[PDB]
CSV table of C-alpha atoms in Angstrom, one decimal:
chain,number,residue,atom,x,y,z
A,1,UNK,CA,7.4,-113.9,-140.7
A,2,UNK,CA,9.4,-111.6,-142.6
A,3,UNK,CA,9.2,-108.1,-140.7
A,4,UNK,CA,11.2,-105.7,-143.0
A,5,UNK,CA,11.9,-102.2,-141.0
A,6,UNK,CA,13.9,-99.4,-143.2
A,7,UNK,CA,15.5,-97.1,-140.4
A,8,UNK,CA,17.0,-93.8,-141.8
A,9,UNK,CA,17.8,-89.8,-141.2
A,10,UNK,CA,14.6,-87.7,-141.0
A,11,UNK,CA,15.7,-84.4,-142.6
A,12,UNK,CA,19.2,-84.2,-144.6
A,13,UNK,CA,20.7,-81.2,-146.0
A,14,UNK,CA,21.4,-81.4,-150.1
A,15,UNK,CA,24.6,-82.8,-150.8
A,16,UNK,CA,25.2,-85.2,-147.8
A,17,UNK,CA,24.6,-89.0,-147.8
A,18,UNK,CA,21.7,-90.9,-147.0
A,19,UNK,CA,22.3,-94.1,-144.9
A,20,UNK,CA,19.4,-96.0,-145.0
A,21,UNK,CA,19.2,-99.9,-143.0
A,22,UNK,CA,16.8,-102.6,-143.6
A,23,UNK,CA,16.1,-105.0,-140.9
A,24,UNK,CA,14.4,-108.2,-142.1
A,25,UNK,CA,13.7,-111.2,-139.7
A,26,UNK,CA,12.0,-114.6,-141.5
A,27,UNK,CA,13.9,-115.5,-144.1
A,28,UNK,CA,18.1,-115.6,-144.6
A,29,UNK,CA,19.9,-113.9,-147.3
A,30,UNK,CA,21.8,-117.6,-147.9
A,31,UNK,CA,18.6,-118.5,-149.1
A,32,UNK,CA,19.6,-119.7,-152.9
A,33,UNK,CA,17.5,-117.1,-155.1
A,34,UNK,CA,17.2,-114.5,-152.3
A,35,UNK,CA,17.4,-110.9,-152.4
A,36,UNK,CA,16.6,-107.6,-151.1
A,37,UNK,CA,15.9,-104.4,-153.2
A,38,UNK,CA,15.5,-100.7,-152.2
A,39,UNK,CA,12.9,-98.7,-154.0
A,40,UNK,CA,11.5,-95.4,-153.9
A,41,UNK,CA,8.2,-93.2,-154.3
A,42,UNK,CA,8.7,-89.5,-154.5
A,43,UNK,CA,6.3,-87.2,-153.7
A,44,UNK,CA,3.1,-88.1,-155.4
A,45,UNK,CA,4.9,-89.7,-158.4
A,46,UNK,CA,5.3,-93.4,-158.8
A,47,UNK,CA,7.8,-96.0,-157.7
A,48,UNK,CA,11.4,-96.4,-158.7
A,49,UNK,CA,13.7,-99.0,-158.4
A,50,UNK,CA,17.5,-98.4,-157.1
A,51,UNK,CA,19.0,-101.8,-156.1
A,52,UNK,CA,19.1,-105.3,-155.0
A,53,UNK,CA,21.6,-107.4,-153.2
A,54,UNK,CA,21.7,-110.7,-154.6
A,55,UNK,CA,22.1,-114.2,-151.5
A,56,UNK,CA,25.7,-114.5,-153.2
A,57,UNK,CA,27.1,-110.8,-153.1
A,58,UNK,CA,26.2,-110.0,-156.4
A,59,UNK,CA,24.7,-106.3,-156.5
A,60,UNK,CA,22.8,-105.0,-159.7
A,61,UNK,CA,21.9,-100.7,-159.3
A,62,UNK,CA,19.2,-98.7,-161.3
A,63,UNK,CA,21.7,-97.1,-164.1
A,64,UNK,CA,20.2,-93.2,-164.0
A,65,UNK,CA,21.4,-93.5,-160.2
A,66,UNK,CA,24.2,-96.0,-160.3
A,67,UNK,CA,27.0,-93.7,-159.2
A,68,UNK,CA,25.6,-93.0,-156.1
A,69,UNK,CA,24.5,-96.3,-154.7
A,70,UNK,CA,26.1,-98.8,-152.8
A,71,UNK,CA,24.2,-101.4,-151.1
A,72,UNK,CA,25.6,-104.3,-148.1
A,73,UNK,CA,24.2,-107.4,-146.3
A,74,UNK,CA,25.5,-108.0,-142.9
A,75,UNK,CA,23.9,-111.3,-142.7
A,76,UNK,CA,24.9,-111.6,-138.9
A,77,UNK,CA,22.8,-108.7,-137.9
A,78,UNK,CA,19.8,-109.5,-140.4
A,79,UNK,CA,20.5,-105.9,-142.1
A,80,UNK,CA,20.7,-105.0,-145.7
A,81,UNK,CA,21.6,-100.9,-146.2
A,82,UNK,CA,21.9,-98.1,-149.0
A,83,UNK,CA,23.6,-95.2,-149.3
A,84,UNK,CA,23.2,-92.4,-151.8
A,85,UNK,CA,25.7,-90.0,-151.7
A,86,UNK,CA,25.1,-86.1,-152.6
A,87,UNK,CA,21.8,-86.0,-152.1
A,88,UNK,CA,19.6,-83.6,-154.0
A,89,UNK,CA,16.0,-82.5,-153.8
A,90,UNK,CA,14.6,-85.1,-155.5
A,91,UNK,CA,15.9,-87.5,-153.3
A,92,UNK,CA,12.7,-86.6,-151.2
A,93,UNK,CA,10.9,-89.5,-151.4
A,94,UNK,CA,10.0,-92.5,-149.3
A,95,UNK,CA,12.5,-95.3,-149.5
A,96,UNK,CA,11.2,-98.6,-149.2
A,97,UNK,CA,12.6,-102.5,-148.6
A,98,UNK,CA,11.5,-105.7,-150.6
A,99,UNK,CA,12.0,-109.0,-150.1
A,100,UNK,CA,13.0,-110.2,-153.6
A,101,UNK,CA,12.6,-106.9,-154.9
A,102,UNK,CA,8.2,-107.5,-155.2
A,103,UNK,CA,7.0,-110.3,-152.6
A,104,UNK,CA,7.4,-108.6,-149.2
A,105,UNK,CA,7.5,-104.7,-148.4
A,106,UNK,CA,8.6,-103.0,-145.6
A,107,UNK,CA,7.1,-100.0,-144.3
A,108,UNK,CA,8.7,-97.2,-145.7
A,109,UNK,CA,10.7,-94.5,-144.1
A,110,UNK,CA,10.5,-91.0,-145.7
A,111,UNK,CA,13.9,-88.9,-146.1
A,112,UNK,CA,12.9,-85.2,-146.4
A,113,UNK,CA,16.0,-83.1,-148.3
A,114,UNK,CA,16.1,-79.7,-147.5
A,115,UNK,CA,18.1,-76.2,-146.2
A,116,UNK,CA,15.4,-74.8,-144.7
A,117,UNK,CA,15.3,-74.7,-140.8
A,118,UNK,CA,11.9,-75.0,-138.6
A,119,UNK,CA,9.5,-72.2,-139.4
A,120,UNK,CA,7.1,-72.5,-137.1
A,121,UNK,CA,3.3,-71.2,-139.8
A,122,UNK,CA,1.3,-68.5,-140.4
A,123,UNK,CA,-2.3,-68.8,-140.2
A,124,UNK,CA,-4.4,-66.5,-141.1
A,125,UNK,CA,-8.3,-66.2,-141.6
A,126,UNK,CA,-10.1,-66.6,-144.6
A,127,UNK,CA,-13.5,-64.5,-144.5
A,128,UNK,CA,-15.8,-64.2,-147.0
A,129,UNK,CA,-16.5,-60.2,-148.5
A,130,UNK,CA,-20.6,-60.7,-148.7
A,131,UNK,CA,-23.5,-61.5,-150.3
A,132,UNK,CA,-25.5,-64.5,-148.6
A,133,UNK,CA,-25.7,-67.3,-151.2
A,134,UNK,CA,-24.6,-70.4,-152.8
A,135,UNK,CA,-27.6,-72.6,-151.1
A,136,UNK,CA,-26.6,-70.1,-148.3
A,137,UNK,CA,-24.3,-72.0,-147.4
A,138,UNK,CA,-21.1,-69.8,-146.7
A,139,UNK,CA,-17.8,-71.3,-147.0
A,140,UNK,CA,-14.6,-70.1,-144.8
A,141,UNK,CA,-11.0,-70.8,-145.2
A,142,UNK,CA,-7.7,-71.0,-143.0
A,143,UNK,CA,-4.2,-70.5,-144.6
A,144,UNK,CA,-1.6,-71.7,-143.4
A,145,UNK,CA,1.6,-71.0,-144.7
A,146,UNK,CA,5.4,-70.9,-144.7
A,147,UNK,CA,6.3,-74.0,-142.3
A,148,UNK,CA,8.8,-76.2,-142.2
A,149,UNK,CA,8.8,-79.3,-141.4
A,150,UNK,CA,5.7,-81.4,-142.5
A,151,UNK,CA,2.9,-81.8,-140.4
A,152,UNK,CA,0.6,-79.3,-139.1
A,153,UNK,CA,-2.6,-80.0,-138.1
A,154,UNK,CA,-5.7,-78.3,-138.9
A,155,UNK,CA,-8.9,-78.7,-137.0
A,156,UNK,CA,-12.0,-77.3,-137.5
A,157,UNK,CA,-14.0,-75.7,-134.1
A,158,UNK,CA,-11.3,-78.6,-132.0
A,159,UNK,CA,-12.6,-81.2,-134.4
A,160,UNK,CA,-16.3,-80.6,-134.1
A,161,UNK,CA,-16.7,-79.2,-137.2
A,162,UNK,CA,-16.3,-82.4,-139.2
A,163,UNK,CA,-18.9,-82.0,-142.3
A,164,UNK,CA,-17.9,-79.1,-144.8
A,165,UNK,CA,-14.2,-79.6,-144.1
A,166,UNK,CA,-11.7,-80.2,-147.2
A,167,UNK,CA,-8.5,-79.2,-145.8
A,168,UNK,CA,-6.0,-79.6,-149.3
A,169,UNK,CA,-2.5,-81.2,-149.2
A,170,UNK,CA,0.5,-78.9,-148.1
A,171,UNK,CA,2.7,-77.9,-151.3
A,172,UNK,CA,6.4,-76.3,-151.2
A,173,UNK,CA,6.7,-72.9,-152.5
A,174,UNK,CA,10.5,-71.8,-151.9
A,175,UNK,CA,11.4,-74.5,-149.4
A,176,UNK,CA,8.1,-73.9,-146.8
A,177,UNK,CA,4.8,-75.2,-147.0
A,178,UNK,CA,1.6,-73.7,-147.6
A,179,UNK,CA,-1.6,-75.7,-146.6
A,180,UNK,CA,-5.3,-74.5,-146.5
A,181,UNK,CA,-8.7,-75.8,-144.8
A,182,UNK,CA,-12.3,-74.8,-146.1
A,183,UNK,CA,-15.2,-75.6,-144.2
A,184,UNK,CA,-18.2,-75.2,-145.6
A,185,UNK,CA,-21.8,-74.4,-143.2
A,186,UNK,CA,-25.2,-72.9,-143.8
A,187,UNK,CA,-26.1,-69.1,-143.0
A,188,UNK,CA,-28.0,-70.1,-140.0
A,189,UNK,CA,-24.1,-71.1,-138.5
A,190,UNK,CA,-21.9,-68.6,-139.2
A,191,UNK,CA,-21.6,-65.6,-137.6
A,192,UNK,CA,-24.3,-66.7,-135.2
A,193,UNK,CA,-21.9,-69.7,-134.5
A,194,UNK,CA,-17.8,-69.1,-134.1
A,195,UNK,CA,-15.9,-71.1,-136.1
A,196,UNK,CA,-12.4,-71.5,-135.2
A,197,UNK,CA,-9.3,-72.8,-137.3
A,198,UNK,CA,-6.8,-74.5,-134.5
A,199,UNK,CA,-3.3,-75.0,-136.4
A,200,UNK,CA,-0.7,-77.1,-134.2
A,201,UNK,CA,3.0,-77.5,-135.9
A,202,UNK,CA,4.7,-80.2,-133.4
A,203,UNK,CA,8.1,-79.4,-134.8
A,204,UNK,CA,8.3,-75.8,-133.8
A,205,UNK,CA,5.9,-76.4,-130.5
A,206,UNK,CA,3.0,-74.0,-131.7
A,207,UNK,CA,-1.0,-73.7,-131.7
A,208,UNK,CA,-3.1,-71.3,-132.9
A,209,UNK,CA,-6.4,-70.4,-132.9
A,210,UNK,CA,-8.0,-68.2,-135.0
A,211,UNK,CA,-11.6,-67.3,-134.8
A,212,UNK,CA,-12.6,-66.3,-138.7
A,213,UNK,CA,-14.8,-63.5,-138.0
A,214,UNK,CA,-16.9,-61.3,-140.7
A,215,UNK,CA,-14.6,-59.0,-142.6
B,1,UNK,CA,14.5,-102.2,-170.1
B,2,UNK,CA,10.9,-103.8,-170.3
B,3,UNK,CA,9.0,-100.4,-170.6
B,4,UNK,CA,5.4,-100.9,-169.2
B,5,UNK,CA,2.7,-99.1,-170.5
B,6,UNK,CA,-0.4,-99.7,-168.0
B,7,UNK,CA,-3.7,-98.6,-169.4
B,8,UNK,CA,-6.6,-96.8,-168.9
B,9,UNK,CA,-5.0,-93.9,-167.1
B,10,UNK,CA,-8.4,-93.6,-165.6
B,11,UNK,CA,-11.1,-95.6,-164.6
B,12,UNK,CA,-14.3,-94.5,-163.4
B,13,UNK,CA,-16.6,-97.6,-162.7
B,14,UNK,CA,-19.8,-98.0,-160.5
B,15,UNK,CA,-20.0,-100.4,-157.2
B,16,UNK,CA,-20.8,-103.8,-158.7
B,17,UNK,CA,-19.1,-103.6,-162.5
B,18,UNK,CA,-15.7,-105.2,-163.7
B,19,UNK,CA,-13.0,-103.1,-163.8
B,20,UNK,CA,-10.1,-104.0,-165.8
B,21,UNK,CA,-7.0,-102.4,-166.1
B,22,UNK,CA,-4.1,-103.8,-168.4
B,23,UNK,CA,-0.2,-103.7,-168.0
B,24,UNK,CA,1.8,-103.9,-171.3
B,25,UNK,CA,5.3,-104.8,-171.5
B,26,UNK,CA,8.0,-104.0,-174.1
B,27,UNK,CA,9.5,-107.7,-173.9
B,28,UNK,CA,9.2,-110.9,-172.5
B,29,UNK,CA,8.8,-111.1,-168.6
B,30,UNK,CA,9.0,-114.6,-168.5
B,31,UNK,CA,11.9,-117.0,-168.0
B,32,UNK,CA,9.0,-119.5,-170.4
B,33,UNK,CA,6.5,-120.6,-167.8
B,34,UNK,CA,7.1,-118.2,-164.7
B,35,UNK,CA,5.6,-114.7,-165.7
B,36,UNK,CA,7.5,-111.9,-163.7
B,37,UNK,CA,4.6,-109.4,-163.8
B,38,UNK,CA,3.2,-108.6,-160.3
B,39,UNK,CA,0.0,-106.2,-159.8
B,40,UNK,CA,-0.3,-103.5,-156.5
B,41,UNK,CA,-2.8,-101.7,-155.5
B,42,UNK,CA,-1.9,-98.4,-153.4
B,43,UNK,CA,-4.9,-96.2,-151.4
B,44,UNK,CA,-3.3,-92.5,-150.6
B,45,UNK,CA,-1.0,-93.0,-147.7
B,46,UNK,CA,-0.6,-96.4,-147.9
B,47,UNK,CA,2.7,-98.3,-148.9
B,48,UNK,CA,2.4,-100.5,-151.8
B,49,UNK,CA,-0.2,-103.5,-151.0
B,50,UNK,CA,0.9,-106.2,-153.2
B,51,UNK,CA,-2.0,-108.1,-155.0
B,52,UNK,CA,-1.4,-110.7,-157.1
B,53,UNK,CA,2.3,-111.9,-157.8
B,54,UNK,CA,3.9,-113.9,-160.4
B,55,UNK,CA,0.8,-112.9,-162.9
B,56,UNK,CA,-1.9,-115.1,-161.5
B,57,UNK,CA,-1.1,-115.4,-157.6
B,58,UNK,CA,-3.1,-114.1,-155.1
B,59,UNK,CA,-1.4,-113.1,-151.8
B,60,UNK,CA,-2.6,-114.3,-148.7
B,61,UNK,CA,-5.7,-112.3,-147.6
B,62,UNK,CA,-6.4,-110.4,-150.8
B,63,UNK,CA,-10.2,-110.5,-151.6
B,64,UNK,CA,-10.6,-113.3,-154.1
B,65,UNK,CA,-12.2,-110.5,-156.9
B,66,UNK,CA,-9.1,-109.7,-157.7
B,67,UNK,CA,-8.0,-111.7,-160.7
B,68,UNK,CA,-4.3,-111.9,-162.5
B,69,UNK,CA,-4.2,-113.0,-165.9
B,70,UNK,CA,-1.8,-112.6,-168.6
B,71,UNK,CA,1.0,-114.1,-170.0
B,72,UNK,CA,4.9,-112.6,-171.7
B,73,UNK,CA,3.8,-109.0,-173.0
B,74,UNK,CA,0.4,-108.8,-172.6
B,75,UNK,CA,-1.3,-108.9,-168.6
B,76,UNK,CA,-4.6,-107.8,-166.8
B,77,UNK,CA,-5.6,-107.1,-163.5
B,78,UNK,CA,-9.7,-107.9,-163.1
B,79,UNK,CA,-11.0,-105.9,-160.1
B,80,UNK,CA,-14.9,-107.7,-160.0
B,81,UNK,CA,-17.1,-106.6,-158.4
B,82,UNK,CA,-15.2,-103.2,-158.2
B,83,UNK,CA,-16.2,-102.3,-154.3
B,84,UNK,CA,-15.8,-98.7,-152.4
B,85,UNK,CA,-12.8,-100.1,-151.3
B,86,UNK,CA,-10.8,-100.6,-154.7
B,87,UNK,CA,-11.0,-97.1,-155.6
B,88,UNK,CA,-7.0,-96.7,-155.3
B,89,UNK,CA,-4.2,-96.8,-157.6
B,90,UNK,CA,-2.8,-100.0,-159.9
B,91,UNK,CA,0.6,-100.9,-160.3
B,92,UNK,CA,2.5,-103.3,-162.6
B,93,UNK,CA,6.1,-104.4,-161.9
B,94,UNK,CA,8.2,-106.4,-163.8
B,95,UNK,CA,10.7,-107.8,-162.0
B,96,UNK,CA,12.1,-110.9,-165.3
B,97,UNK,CA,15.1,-108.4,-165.6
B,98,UNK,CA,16.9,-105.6,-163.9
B,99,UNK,CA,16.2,-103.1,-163.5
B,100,UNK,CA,12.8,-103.4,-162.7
B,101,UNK,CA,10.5,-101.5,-164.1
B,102,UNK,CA,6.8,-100.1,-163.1
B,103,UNK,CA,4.0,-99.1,-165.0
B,104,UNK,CA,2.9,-95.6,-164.7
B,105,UNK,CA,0.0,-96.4,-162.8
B,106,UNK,CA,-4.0,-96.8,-163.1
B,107,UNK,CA,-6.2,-94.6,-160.6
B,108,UNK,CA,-9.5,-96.7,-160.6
B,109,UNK,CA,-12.3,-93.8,-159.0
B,110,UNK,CA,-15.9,-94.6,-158.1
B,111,UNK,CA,-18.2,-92.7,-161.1
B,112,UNK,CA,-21.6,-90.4,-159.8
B,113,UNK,CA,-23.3,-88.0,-161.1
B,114,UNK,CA,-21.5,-84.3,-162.5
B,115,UNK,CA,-21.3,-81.5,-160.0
B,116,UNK,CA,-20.2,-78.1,-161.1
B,117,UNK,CA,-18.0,-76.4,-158.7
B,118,UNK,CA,-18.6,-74.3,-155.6
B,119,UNK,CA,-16.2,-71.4,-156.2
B,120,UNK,CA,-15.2,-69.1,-153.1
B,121,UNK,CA,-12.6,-66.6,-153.3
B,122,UNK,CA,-10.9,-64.8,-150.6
B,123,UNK,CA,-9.1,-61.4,-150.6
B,124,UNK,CA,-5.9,-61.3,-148.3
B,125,UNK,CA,-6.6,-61.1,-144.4
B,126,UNK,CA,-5.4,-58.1,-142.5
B,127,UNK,CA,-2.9,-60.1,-140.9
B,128,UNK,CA,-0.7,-60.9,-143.7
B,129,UNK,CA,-1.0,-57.6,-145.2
B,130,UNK,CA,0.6,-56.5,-141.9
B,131,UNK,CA,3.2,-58.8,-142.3
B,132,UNK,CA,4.1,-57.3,-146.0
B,133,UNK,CA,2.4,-60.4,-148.2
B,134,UNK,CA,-0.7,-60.7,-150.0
B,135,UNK,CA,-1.9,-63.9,-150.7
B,136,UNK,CA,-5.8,-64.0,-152.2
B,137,UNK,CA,-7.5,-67.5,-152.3
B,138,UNK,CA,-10.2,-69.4,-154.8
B,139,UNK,CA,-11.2,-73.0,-153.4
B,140,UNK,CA,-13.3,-75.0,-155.9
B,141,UNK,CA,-15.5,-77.4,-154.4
B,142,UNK,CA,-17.7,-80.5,-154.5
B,143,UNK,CA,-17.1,-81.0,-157.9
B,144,UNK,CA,-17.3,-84.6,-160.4
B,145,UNK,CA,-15.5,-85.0,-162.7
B,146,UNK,CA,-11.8,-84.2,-161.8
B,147,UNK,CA,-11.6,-82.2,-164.9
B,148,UNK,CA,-11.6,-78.3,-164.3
B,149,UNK,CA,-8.9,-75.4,-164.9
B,150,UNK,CA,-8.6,-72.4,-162.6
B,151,UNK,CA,-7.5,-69.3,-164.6
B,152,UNK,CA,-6.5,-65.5,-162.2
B,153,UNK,CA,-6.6,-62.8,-163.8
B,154,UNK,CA,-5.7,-59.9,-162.4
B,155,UNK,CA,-7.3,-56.1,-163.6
B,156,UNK,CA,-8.3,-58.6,-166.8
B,157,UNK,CA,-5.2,-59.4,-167.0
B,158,UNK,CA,-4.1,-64.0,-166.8
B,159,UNK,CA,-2.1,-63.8,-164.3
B,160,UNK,CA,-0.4,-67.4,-164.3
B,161,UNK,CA,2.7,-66.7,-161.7
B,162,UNK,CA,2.7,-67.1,-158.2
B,163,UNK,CA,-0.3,-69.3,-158.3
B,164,UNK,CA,-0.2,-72.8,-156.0
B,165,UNK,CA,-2.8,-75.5,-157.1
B,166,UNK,CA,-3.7,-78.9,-154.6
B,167,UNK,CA,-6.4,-81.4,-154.8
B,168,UNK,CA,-8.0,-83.2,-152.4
B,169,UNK,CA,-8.8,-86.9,-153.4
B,170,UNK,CA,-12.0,-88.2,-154.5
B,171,UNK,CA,-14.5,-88.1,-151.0
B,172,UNK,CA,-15.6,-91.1,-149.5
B,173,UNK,CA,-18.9,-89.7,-149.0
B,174,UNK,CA,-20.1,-88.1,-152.1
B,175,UNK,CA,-17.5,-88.6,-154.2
B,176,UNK,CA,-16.6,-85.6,-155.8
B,177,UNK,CA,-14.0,-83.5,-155.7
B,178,UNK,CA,-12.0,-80.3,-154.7
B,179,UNK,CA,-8.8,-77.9,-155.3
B,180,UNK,CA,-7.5,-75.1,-154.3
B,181,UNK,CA,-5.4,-72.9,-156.0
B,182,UNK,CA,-3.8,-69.2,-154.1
B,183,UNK,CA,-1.9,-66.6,-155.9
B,184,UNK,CA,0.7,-65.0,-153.9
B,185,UNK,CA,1.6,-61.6,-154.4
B,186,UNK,CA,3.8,-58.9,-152.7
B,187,UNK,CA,1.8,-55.9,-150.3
B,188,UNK,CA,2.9,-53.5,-153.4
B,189,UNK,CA,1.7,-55.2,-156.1
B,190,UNK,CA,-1.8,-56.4,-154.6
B,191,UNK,CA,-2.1,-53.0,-153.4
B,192,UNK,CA,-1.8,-51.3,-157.5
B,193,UNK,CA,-4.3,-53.7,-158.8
B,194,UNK,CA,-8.4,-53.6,-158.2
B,195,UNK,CA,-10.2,-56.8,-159.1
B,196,UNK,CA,-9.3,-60.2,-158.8
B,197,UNK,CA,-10.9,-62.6,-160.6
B,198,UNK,CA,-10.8,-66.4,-160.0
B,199,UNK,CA,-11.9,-68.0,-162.8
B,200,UNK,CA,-13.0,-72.0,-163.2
B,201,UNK,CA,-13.8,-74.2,-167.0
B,202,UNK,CA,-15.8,-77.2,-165.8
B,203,UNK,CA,-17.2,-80.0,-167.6
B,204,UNK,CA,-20.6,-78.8,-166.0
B,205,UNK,CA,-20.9,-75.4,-167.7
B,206,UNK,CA,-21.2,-73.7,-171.1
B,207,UNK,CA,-18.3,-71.2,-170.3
B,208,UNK,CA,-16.9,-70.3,-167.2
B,209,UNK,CA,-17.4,-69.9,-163.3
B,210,UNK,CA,-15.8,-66.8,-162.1
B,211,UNK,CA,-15.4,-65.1,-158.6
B,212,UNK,CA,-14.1,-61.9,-158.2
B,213,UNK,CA,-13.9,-58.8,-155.9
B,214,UNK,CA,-12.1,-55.4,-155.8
B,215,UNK,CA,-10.6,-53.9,-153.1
């Protein structure tokens, strides 16, 4: 009932190629009119179109890209596929597959382009220096930075501390990311109350805890 | 290429009034009587959800507020009664002639009351300084409207390199907002310098919010 499933590489140095499949079940690429289209949405920007296979063979790319796409049906195996060759860095996106190139969207899978390895993060504290205040409210922080690949997790107190928390998105900074939590509690909590960061990176196979403790 | 030139950029709007946003194309998007311009609303995280299609069609299980209307250039997208839910971002595809094209998007955000910023700013923990960095933090928080400016400056001086900025989207329960910006520097350099100032321009305030420390 059209299920559209884009398979791809996770991570991909700069300058291979990116082999993408699309896997659609519920509706035939014989169909007269039918299509499927690749598009993508890079990190935090908007969409952008790259191609479409038409049910008669006929392929139509996005110019800007054009000479590095080529897309193919095998209508025996219910799979449409892209390739991009000599990727780049703003290849990074998450590249998507549409019925008709609007009426049915597949998941997404992300493609990550980069030549760093796994850096497993730094996390470090972030105390305040003193002076209670601020509805005496104290707020605390936990960097963590230099880490590659996405996710870490950040939890506040093992996910007890769940009001007060603002953890901010990870950005790159020379191919690593740097993310950072706040958490924000009355005087009456801290330092009467420990408060600790717990960063987990799966890819490297690493926890932390960090108690933030007065400077 | 049929350009599309969505407007507002912004919408703040209240649970309960009509929120419209428009999509304007450069040409025609029809093929006279079928009107190639579909609507998508996208929450952060999600993958496209498609709307409306073919200007005025609902999908399947979108919640009937949703109206498509338009027709050739002009088209609009009629969120009413604009719910917690809908605060997201609007899309408009074209899809009359390849390549297709999207508008540059609408992020629709529930209004409230101004806040002024929380600023909190954080010298480098011992840890990294160990390690040979220095990286000192500001997070500005609980804050409406979006619009503020973070400014370092370092011995008086506006430091604007080495800085890294993120937002956090608008909160679900107070809706307001927060960012975080941290300004890397080497061990030397944060070691030859005395006060760091982290300084924030808010809608809220005459002239600006500033945290700073010495070492």
């Amino acid at each position: 009932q059209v299920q559209l499933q884009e398979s791809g590489p996770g991570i991909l140095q700069p300058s291979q190629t990116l082999s993408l499949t699309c896997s659609f079940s519920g509706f035939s690429l014989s169909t007269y009119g039918m299509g499927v289209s690749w598009i993508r949405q890079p990190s935090g920007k908007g969409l952008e179109w790259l191609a479409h296979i038409f049910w008669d063979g006929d392929k139509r790319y996005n110019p800007s890209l054009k000479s590095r796409l080529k897309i193919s049906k095998d209508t025996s195996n219910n799979q449409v596929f892209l390739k991009i060759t000599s990727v780049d860095t703003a290849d990074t996106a998450t590249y998507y597959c549409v019925q008709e190139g609007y009426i049915y969207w597949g998941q997404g899978t992300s493609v990550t382009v980069s030549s760093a390895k796994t850096t497993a993060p730094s996390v470090y504290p972030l105390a305040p220096v003193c002076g209670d205040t601020t509805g005496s409210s104290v707020t605390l922080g936990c960097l963590v930075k230099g880490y590659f690949p996405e996710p870490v997790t950040l939890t506040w107190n093992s996910g007890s501390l769940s009001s007060g928390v603002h953890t901010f998105p990870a950005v790159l900074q020379s191919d690593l990311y740097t993310l950072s939590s706040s958490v924000t509690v009355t005087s009456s909590t801290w330092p009467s109350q420990s408060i600790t960061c717990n960063v987990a990176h799966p890819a490297s196979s690493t926890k932390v805890d960090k108690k933030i403790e007065p400077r | 290429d049929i350009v599309l030139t969505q407007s507002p950029g912004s919408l703040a709007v209240s649970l309960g009034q009509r929120a419209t946003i428009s999509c304007r194309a450069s040409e025609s998007v029809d093929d006279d009587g079928n009107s190639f311009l579909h609507w998508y609303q996208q929450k952060p995280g999600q993958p496209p959800k498609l709307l409306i299609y073919r200007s005025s069609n609902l999908i399947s299980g979108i919640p009937d507020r949703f109206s498509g209307s338009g027709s050739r250039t002009d088209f609009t997208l009629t969120i009413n009664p604009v719910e917690a839910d809908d605060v997201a971002t609007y899309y408009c595809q074209q899809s009359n002639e390849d390549p297709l094209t999207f508008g540059a998007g609408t992020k629709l955000e529930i209004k409230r009351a101004d806040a002024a910023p929380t600023v909190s700013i954080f010298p480098p923990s011992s840890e990294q300084l160990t390690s040979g960095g220095a990286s000192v933090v500001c997070f500005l928080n609980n804050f409406y409207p979006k619009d503020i400016n973070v400014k370092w400056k370092i011995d008086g001086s506006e430091r604007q390199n080495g800085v890294l900025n993120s937002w956090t989207d608008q909160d679900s329960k107070d809706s307001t907002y927060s960012m975080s910006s941290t300004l890397t520097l080497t061990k030397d350099e944060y070691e030859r310098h005395n006060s760091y100032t982290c300084e924030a321009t808010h809608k809220t305030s005459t002239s600006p919010i500033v945290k700073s420390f010495n070492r």
